[PDB]
Amino acid sequence: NFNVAHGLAWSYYIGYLRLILPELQARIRTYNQHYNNLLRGAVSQRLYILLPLDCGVPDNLSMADPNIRFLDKLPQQTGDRAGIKDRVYSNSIYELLENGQRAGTCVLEYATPLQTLFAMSQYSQAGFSREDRLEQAKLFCRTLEDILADAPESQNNCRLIAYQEPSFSLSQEVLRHLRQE
Amino acid sequence: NFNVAHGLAWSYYIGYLRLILPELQARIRTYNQHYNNLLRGAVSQRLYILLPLDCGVPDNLSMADPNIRFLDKLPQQTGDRAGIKDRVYSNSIYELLENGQRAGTCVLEYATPLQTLFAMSQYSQAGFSREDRLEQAKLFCRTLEDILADAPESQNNCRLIAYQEPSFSLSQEVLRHLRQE
Numbered sequence: 001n002f003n004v005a006h007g008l009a010w011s012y013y014i015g016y017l018r019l020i021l022p023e024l025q026a027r028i029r030t031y032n033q034h035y036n037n038l039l040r041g042a043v044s045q046r047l048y049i050l051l052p053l054d055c056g057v058p059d060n061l062s063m064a065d066p067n068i069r070f071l072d073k074l075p076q077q078t079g080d081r082a083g084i085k086d087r088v089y090s091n092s093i094y095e096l097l098e099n100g101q102r103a104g105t106c107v108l109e110y111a112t113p114l115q116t117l118f119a120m121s122q123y124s125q126a127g128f129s130r131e132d133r134l135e136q137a138k139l140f141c142r143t144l145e146d147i148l149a150d151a152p153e154s155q156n157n158c159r160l161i162a163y164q165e166p167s168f169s170l171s172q173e174v175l176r177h178l179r180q181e
Numbered sequence: 182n183f184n185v186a187h188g189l190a191w192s193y194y195i196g197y198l199r200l201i202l203p204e205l206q207a208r209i210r211t212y213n214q215h216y217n218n219l220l221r222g223a224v225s226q227r228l229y230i231l232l233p234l235d236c237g238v239p240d241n242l243s244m245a246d247p248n249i250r251f252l253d254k255l256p257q258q259t260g261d262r263a264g265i266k267d268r269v270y271s272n273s274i275y276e277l278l279e280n281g282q283r284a285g286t287c288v289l290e291y292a293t294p295l296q297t298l299f300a301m302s303q304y305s306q307a308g309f310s311r312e313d314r315l316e317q318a319k320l321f322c323r324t325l326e327d328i329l330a331d332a333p334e335s336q337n338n339c340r341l342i343a344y345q346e347p348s349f350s351l352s353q354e355v356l357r358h359l360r361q362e
């Protein structure tokens with residue numbers, strides 16, 4: 001089933017990352033200056049993209065880790081897309097708690113296509129086993145990192161976080177990446 | 182490359198159609214009663230989905246046909262999705278002109294995944310020829326009509342319009358479907 005992950009990786013890039021990454025640093029500037037709390041840390045640059053290989057994508061991040069808490073939204077990006085006037089691209093800023101205190105602030109979300117690889121394995125008519133799914137989850141991440149390696153839109157404004165669950169802390173996995181910068 | 186279209190069809194269903202179709206008749210009710218012009222035709226039920234097999238998806242429908250004109254937006258649907266608080270699902274209402282007069286009003290848009298099959302054929306690193314693309318465009322449409330055939334969310338609130346360009350009128354192709362109901 002090689003082609004499934006390949007197509008979803010190209011779709012994620014073409015349909016989302018190449019569209020929102022060019023305007024992301026500008027949107028974070030705007031938030032930092034005009035909407036961020038005077039007394040709090042600037043939102044970090046770069047979109048943090050969670051890639052659970054078990055494809056467990058909760059809709060609420062706080063369900064993954066209590067130490068990951070919704071703070072605010074960036075200014076919305078809108079554009080005409082395929083006959084939709086003002087299609088909305090929205091992103092969410094999280095606080096990452098270390099010892100019940102804020103250790104960092106970033107734009108953070110899951111790669112939605114993985115929620116879709118999950119659903120596809122659950123639907124009989126899709127013909128996609130749960131074995132197929134760990135494999136295609138890996139291929140999706142690889143394909144996406146190859147694409148971004150050559151992408152002119154990734155000018156260091158995007159960070160992939162791939163991880164496997166065997167006590168594992170997501171907030172710690174994000175802070176580990178966030179602190180490399 | 183069978184698996185490319187298959188995955189994008191399942192993604193379109195899981196990631197969009199199964200989420201927005203259940204709440205679509207309610208959203209059209211609301212528009213008809215509270216926002217539609219007193220003196221104009223009700224917006225038709227059902228989401229009209231354009232499926233050009235040449236995968237030519239302009240962002241503005243008026244570029245496909247001057248007789249297809251943006252009228253208004255439905256009320257926005259929002260929900261937490263994969264760590265995005267209040268991700269926005271937006272749809273656009275078009276007037277279909279026959280003889281410079283309104284012959285019909287419907288929620289109308291292109292299947293975005295086809296814009297993506299187009300882009301994929303244009304990018305060297307995707308490894309996807311323009312021959313592959315007409316084939317995968319056909320498979321996408323088939324896979325999608327099989328999915329919807331069994332879908333509990335498609336309770337006759339969704340209409341696929343597949344078409345090939347060889348004078349062809351899109352507004353006439355939409356009015357032909359719209360008038361079957």
Ligand SMILES: Nc1nc2c(ncn2[C@@H]2O[C@@H]3CO[P@@](=O)(S)O[C@H]4C[C@H](Nc5ccncn5)C[C@@H]4CO[P@@](=O)(S)O[C@@H]2[C@@H]3O)c(=O)[nH]1
Nearest residue numbers: 011012015016089112113116192193196197270293294297
């Ligand atoms: N027509 C129409 N189709 C839609 C819409 N929303 C989703 N889909 C389609 O549903 C399938 C799976 O959706 P998913 O969330 S898993 O994947 C998306 C995720 C990412 N896009 C975004 C956008 C905003 N915020 C965050 N990410 C790229 C990827 C492909 O996005 P596309 O636009 S190219 O098409 C998808 C795909 O086929 C919509 O509003 N209109």
